[PDB]
Structure formats: C-alpha cells, structure tokens
C-alpha cells in the first residue's frame, strides 16, 4: 500500500471504477471531469487494462483536474455545447469527484461542475 496521503493506485482506479458502475440515482448530482485528465490518469494508475506501462510513472501524473476544455470561452462556469460523456468529459458521483479532488484536486480558478442526472 503506497501513498501516505490519498489512495494507492491499485485502489484509485478500482475504487473509481466502482463509481462508474455505481448507480446515478435519478435526481442526484454528479460532477464533470474532463476526459483527458482521466485518460491521462488511466495510464498513470493502470486503469486501462492494456496500458499499465505508465502505471506509477511520473510522466503521466495528472495534476489538478482541468475542466478548461469543457468550459466555455470566457466563463469557467459555463460548459460548451458539443460536450458529451467520456468522449468529451466524464462524470463522477460526489465521491468519485471527491476522490479525485482529494487525490489531485481541482485546478485553480475552477469550480466543480455539477451535473444532475439526466432526465432522459
């Protein structure tokens, strides 16, 4: 078990994997993550099963979660139009986001983008 603070990587990827399979609850509040940070994270953490060459690597260390690519031109509180799920962004449950923010926090100048569960 590594990391005195935060979770072990073996733990990180797997615990969050648990959050993706986790129920969303109609009327709940999820939080967006840019897919790129998370995809970077997958490498680093060994989330993606073929891609554990970067596992534990510092090269692939995803620092603070950066939703700037999701955020509109001018407003950090405004999401862009073409945004879709893991294709563009991702959502985490409260915990999921909390984890990621507990481990690597959120970028400076940003706020969590909370997305209610879809009405579809």
UniProtKB/Swiss-Prot annotation:
PTM info: Phosphorylated. Phosphorylation protects against ubiquitination and subsequent degradation by the proteasome. Ubiquitinated, leading to degradation by the proteasome.
Compartment(s): Cytoplasm; Nucleus; Mitochondrion
Positions where N-acetylalanine occurs in the chain: 2
Ranges of residues in domain DUSP: 7-118
Coiled-coil annotated residue ranges, if any: none
Tissue: Expressed in skeletal muscle, kidney, heart, placenta, liver, thymus, lung, and ovary, with little or no expression in other tissues.
Role this protein plays: Hydrolase that removes conjugated ubiquitin from target proteins and regulates various pathways such as the TGF-beta receptor signaling, NF-kappa-B and RNF41/NRDP1-PRKN pathways. Acts as a key regulator of TGF-beta receptor signaling pathway, but the precise mechanism is still unclear: according to a report, acts by promoting deubiquitination of monoubiquitinated R-SMADs (SMAD1, SMAD2 and/or SMAD3), thereby alleviating inhibition of R-SMADs and promoting activation of TGF-beta target genes. (Microbial infection) Protects APC and human papillomavirus type 16 protein E6 against degradation via the ubiquitin proteasome pathway.
Oligomer status and interactors: A homodimer structure has been reported; however it is unclear whether the protein form a homodimer in vivo. Identified in a complex with the COP9 signalosome complex (CSN). Interacts with SMAD1, SMAD2 and SMAD3; the interaction is direct. Forms a complex with SMURF2 and SMAD7. Interacts with TGFBR1. Interacts with SART3; the interaction is direct. May interact with RNF20 and RNF40. May interact with PRKN. Interacts with INCA1.
Homology family: Belongs to the peptidase C19 family.
Name of the molecule in the record: Ubiquitin carboxyl-terminal hydrolase 15
């Amino acid at each position: 078990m590594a990391e005195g603070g935060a979770a072990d990587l073996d733990t990180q990827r797997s615990d969050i994997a648990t959050l993706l399979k986790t129920s969303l609850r109609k009327g709940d509040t999820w939080y967006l993550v840019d897919s790129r940070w998370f995809k970077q994270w997958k490498k680093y953490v060994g989330f993606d099963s073929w891609d554990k060459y970067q596992m534990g690597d510092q090269n692939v260390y995803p620092g603070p979660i950066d939703n700037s690519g999701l955020l509109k031109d001018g407003d950090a509180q405004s999401l862009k139009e073409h945004l879709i799920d893991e294709l563009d962004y991702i959502l985490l449950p409260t915990e999921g986001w909390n984890k990621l923010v507990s481990w690597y926090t959120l970028m400076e100048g940003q706020e969590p983008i909370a997305r209610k569960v879809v009405e579809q």
